[PDB]
Amino acid sequence: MVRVAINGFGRIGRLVMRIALSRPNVEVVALNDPFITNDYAAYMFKYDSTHGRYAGEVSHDDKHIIVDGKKIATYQERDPANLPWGSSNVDIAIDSTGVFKELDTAQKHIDAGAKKVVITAPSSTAPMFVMGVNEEKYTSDLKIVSNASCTTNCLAPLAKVINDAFGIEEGLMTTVHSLTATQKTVDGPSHKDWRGGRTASGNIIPSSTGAAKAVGKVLPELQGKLTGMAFRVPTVDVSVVDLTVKLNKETTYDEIKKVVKAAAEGKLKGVLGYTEDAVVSSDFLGDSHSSIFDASAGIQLSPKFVKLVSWYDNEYGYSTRVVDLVEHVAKA
Amino acid sequence: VRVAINGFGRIGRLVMRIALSRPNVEVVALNDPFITNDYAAYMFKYDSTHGRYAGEVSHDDKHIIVDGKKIATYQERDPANLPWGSSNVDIAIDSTGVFKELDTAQKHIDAGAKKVVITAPSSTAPMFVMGVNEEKYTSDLKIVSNASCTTNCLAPLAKVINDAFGIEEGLMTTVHSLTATQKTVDGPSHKDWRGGRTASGNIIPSSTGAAKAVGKVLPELQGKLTGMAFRVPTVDVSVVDLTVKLNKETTYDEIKKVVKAAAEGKLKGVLGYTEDAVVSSDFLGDSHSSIFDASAGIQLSPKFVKLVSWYDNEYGYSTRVVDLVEHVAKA
Amino acid sequence: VRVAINGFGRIGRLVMRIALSRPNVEVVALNDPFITNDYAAYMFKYDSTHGRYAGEVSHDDKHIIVDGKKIATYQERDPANLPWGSSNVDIAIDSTGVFKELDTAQKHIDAGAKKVVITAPSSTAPMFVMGVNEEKYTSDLKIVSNASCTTNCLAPLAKVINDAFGIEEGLMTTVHSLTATQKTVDGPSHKDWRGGRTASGNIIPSSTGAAKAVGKVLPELQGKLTGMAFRVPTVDVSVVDLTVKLNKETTYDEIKKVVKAAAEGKLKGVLGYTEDAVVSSDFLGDSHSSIFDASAGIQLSPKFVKLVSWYDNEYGYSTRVVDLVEHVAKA
Amino acid sequence: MVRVAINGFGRIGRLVMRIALSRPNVEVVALNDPFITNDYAAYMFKYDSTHGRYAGEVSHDDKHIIVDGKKIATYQERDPANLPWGSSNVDIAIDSTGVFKELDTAQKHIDAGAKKVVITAPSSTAPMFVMGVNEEKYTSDLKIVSNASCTTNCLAPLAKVINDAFGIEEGLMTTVHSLTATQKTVDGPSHKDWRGGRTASGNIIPSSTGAAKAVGKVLPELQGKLTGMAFRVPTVDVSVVDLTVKLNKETTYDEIKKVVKAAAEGKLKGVLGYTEDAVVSSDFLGDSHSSIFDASAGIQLSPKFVKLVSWYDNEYGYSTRVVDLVEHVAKA
Ligand SMILES: NC(=O)c1ccc[n+]([C@@H]2O[C@H](COP(=O)([O-])OP(=O)(O)OC[C@H]3O[C@@H](n4cnc5c(N)ncnc54)[C@H](O)[C@@H]3O)[C@@H](O)[C@H]2O)c1
Ligand SMILES: NC(=O)c1ccc[n+]([C@@H]2O[C@H](COP(=O)([O-])OP(=O)(O)OC[C@H]3O[C@@H](n4cnc5c(N)ncnc54)[C@H](O)[C@@H]3O)[C@@H](O)[C@H]2O)c1
Ligand SMILES: NC(=O)c1ccc[n+]([C@@H]2O[C@H](COP(=O)([O-])OP(=O)(O)OC[C@H]3O[C@@H](n4cnc5c(N)ncnc54)[C@H](O)[C@@H]3O)[C@@H](O)[C@H]2O)c1
Ligand SMILES: NC(=O)c1ccc[n+]([C@@H]2O[C@H](COP(=O)([O-])OP(=O)(O)OC[C@H]3O[C@@H](n4cnc5c(N)ncnc54)[C@H](O)[C@@H]3O)[C@@H](O)[C@H]2O)c1
Ligand SMILES: OC[C@@H](O)[C@@H](O)CO
Ligand SMILES: OC[C@@H](O)[C@@H](O)CO
Ligand SMILES: OC[C@@H](O)[C@@H](O)CO
Ligand SMILES: OC[C@@H](O)[C@@H](O)CO
Ligand code: NA
Numbered sequence A, D: 001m002v003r004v005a006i007n008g009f010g011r012i013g014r015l016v017m018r019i020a021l022s023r024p025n026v027e028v029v030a031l032n033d034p035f036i037t038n039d040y041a042a043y044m045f046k047y048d049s050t051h052g053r054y055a056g057e058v059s060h061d062d063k064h065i066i067v068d069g070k071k072i073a074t075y076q077e078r079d080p081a082n083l084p085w086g087s088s089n090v091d092i093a094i095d096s097t098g099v100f101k102e103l104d105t106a107q108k109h110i111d112a113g114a115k116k117v118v119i120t121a122p123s124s125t126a127p128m129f130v131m132g133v134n135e136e137k138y139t140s141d142l143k144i145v146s147n148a149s150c151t152t153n154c155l156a157p158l159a160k161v162i163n164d165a166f167g168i169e170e171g172l173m174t175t176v177h178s179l180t181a182t183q184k185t186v187d188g189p190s191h192k193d194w195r196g197g198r199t200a201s202g203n204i205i206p207s208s209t210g211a212a213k214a215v216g217k218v219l220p221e222l223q224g225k226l227t228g229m230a231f232r233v234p235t236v237d238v239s240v241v242d243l244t245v246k247l248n249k250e251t252t253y254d255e256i257k258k259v260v261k262a263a264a265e266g267k268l269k270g271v272l273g274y275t276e277d278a279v280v281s282s283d284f285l286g287d288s289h290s291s292i293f294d295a296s297a298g299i300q301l302s303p304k305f306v307k308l309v310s311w312y313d314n315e316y317g318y319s320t321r322v323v324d325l326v327e328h329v330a331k332a
Numbered sequence B, C: 001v002r003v004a005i006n007g008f009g010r011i012g013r014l015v016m017r018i019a020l021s022r023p024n025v026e027v028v029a030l031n032d033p034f035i036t037n038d039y040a041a042y043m044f045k046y047d048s049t050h051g052r053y054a055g056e057v058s059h060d061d062k063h064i065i066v067d068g069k070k071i072a073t074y075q076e077r078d079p080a081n082l083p084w085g086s087s088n089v090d091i092a093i094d095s096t097g098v099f100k101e102l103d104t105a106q107k108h109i110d111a112g113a114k115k116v117v118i119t120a121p122s123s124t125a126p127m128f129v130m131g132v133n134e135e136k137y138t139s140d141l142k143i144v145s146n147a148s149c150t151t152n153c154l155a156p157l158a159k160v161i162n163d164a165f166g167i168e169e170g171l172m173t174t175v176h177s178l179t180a181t182q183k184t185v186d187g188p189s190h191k192d193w194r195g196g197r198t199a200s201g202n203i204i205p206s207s208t209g210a211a212k213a214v215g216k217v218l219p220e221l222q223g224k225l226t227g228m229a230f231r232v233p234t235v236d237v238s239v240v241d242l243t244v245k246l247n248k249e250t251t252y253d254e255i256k257k258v259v260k261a262a263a264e265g266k267l268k269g270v271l272g273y274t275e276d277a278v279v280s281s282d283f284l285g286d287s288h289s290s291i292f293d294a295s296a297g298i299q300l301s302p303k304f305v306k307l308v309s310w311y312d313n314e315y316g317y318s319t320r321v322v323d324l325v326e327h328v329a330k331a
């Protein structure tokens, strides 16, 4: 229809559902989340501390949540291979659990009867696509794909614009990133990421990230030319990339602005935004762009050495791109 | 007294810090099946709320080491298997939250510990609050509970007020710092839906049995108190707001005089007293159970008054755990 | 009704947003001697708490412009000089906090406005709270106050409870979001020492006259209520925790039934009612004065109960300012 | 003695006083702050939301605050030229108001009878000094000096070490900075810095900063080679610099670490620190270093292009350097 099902009803799953319910040609057929019951699901969907109450009627019955009359079947399988995606006629299963992110594990949705899978996270084996960057490379024989990460969606469109116009010799990126669900409210155990265990709302927390390197997977011409790191900070949503790049061709910051603005208003419209206003992170809450270039924050030291700044609602911008990729794959 | 700690969360770690500075307490062992020794040493050394441990912290294959004291570590999901017998543990301190009843805390005694202190309220293990009813501890009790941080804040003040003026009944609210059970962004919390909501961006109502539990350590107030909590985004330090109906007419100055005499007297180091313009961060690291805030309280009529008392919900309480350990060893 | 706003802080700006969506209100003018027009347009368009204005905002040499409506701006430290007469202003809305008494608010009438609404409690100007005593407004009153956000939250609930069960007396606490008077890091606040302390890292006790002021809009409760506040790090939305002694024995279900009937009936849009597992962020942008939280409240005995009600201290109150403006114009 | 007086009893003034009271050869003779009375001053000094209660007895009498027996005279002049610095025999007035930061205005303390002035902020006209970087350039004929800013104190010692060993061709810096007193608790007026007016604890807030350029004033060899920007975030204290540098000589990240560690343990001891642990910002609360290199957070993309990370308690590290500069100037 395209008919979709959502696996995992966390931050991304619930917002992907909000957005999908608003797309006329997307039908949300079901959701699966083993960690929450049907009445609880309707509560989590209705109330949102970051993005406000759902603007629509939410209720539930025995086996569904109901949103403005649309019934969405719920399930609670830990193992997605046991889901009824075949008899529910699911075209695309959207996996937002962060747990079935490889070809051999996302394959479980296709085994369960879905025709294709979109993974809402970077993958080492599933081909990655970023709207505005390489979605045109998608072909219909690929049944399992990745939408990369929020940070890669922010960085890649900007990197493409800059590379096309001036050439990126190399670049180092920092993202100052809002806190996320993997973090802890007070110092607790996080054996895979020790800094990530520390009180989230009372610290600046360095973290490694593969997001800048992954740009090289969606733009092969930048393979090996980008890397970066992150600092997690106490804001609840919205993040910003700070990309320090060495350019091949001398340029002025004024020319950089005009090229980004022209791409924002042209071919990357709705993906890359542009502003000259005195913005701060909360001004992008609910913003559906992948990347909003902040022209006034950036700074140029020399004709080929510049620091560029771009904002992103890491929850809402990314969830919109997920639904965009779903619809692209369905029309292709 | 030789102790072992089960659980190495906020309470387990701070109890360890405090225990290492008490000359009559020897920390023999720590159990936490989550963490490895290197990570345990890290979690112990660095603390976002109470600062770096001021001593040398290291580790080896079988221990974490603090200023030369080797602390043996184990990783037993089931405390029954722990080497308490062969470690000559006198008291097992269980800070996991999981073995908080007589029949589960027994696993430490089966493992050879002589006694157990549970760092949480219990339905079945007798509760004690220092300055309130630790006198009632008798040496035949092998398993006991130190109640909760909120009960330790409310009970000493309630005793003082009840003994002097009579509490007919009272409704309490605690404005409480966020806790480890909360979530950084709205996530699943099936037993406490409000508690799943973004911790640092909400005021979050919660139920609490702390006021009711005062009735267990002060039987004369059974049925006379109840209350509720609001969890807010500060990282530590909480405050009780107790609204009481009194049996005897009083003035707020007489209330202040009585609480201060108690803080300076029999409840010294448990109940504190201030008239200064304090805010929550002024009690970070404070070892009192309850610090009465004289200037914040307000009396509407001779038998109806709102009393306010602060507590470092981590540090005050962890200090009382070690106090109760020593009392149970000297008794 | 043609209105002018004095002051362009949190209340001034939100009153402007709400007023621009009321078809019977025309915003003629704004005064704030701090800001220039370009900056006024920016402060109006972007809002960290309530989002971007959903309309086009621009400015020129003498105006800020919102979806084609030109709003004349002035910069007069002394409202006496403002062109209210020659702007045919019916009601001057003073949100500065500075001209909150009869003899100072008079400056707007001297400048030619017909009437004034002061968006703060006043010692001398009569106070009105919608759903509580706006019926008592008489058209000869030129200068009136809309009380405070906390009074607007407490008074409608107190009226409902008092009318049904009788309030003998009550002590209130509000857990209140931080406000513009607070400081980002410990700094000078000579009139309110606790209020100078780092806003986002403390629970901060504060005094409030809001409960006492209920006695001004409901004379039958004069002397029967008082209370205090704790300011905490959330950016907006507050909650009242009202502990009342009742005249008539009741059950908590009868209390719920009465408040719900009122919320669905005569107090619709002023007092709301919920049983859901809400937290503060669920009322961001809510236009009610008071949302009774049925599941958070707790009854200890038949005449002693704790009632809980939420309020968006910016948005609910700004909505009531515009309601009172229109009521005073239709009266 | 050296005898000092403090002008301005804000974050820096109060912490400079805590530290000075602990230095045996520094005598704190007086403080001036027109915006607060004597009993209030004693309260602000005793209680601190960030750095805890003063460990010592604090009281007051009519005209002094008293700390562990030491009486410190208080004053309330808006115009520092009216202070009794001559009859109080003040050797060094420390101006921490952020308001008397030029030669011609700091001069007021010398007119009032102080022999020298140390300004606790960057200055356009007073010569700037950073301990560990160029304090040796101080000569006794200079009566009015600046200790630069906290960010410059963090960046300059690291920049010196890196430049000496590998040569800095150019560098772009970001500081992720804790909130400060100039910021607002909820959106309010800040006509000189519009982004700076926005709710401080609910936003990431870009800001311009001259701190990276100012490194060129204390290290002339780096004049024109550095610039940067800042993001203010909701933590209450402790900041971190993220310095992206182009090097003249190829190197490995491993060699960079060994050079920084050797400087931290040698000539820059107590100014530049070094760690390999999984630290987060709150681990540096109360830390007296200007700069603590975070070896595990940094990342190198190529042999001459690296991102380095260094922490600083912007309040406490800087206030310690103020007292250090005061004592250097007194012994010189
Ligand atoms: N939140 C962001 O800023 C953001 C941005 C871009 C990408 N992502 C990616 O999206 C994915 C989800 O992130 P999130 O922030 O929504 O996390 P989340 O914790 O908010 O949601 C994860 C959800 O999956 C559910 N779940 C866990 N195991 C499951 C299983 N076995 N079957 C079905 N459901 C299961 C959990 O109950 C939880 O509700 C992650 O991979 C994350 O990296 C997140
Ligand atoms: N922190 C407070 O404000 C506070 C105050 C007083 C009492 N308490 C009580 O103390 C208990 C712990 O609270 P906390 O804040 O320390 O939680 P926490 O998350 O900080 O610590 C709990 C720790 O126990 C460990 N653990 C879990 N299961 C275990 C098991 N099977 N065996 C050994 N270790 C295990 C976990 O890894 C975790 O680190 C709770 O019952 C709580 O009610 C908490
Ligand atoms: N914000 C709330 O939660 C809340 C709720 C209800 C009522 N109120 C009341 O409304 C009043 C304003 O509060 P706020 O939060 O809007 O403060 P605010 O700081 O956000 O706004 C006050 C504004 O008034 C302007 N101003 C100051 N003096 C002026 C004058 N001479 N002439 C014109 N403008 C002037 C200032 O520039 C400032 O921007 C206070 O009295 C407060 O008690 C506040
Ligand atoms: N806080 C930091 O992280 C930090 C770090 C490095 C440098 N600095 C610099 O130190 C200076 C002070 O910063 P702060 O953070 O202490 O600010 P603050 O607001 O905390 O302190 C400034 C104090 O000066 C007082 N004051 C204002 N005018 C005065 C005058 N006329 N005479 C006497 N006192 C006056 C104010 O009452 C206030 O208490 C600023 O220039 C700042 O840039 C601050
Ligand atoms: O289950 C329906 C939903 O709208 C919420 O009321 C929360 O329980
Ligand atoms: O200084 C000791 C510290 O490095 C360890 O405890 C954790 O890494
Ligand atoms: O979009 C309008 C906005 O730019 C101004 O109101 C402030 O800069
Ligand atoms: O004025 C003395 C000081 O120690 C504090 O008690 C706060 O008033
Ligand atoms: Na010991």
Ligand code: NA
Pocket (backbone or CB within 6 Å): C019, C020, C021, C022, C023, C024, C025, C026, C027
């Ligand atoms: Na209108």
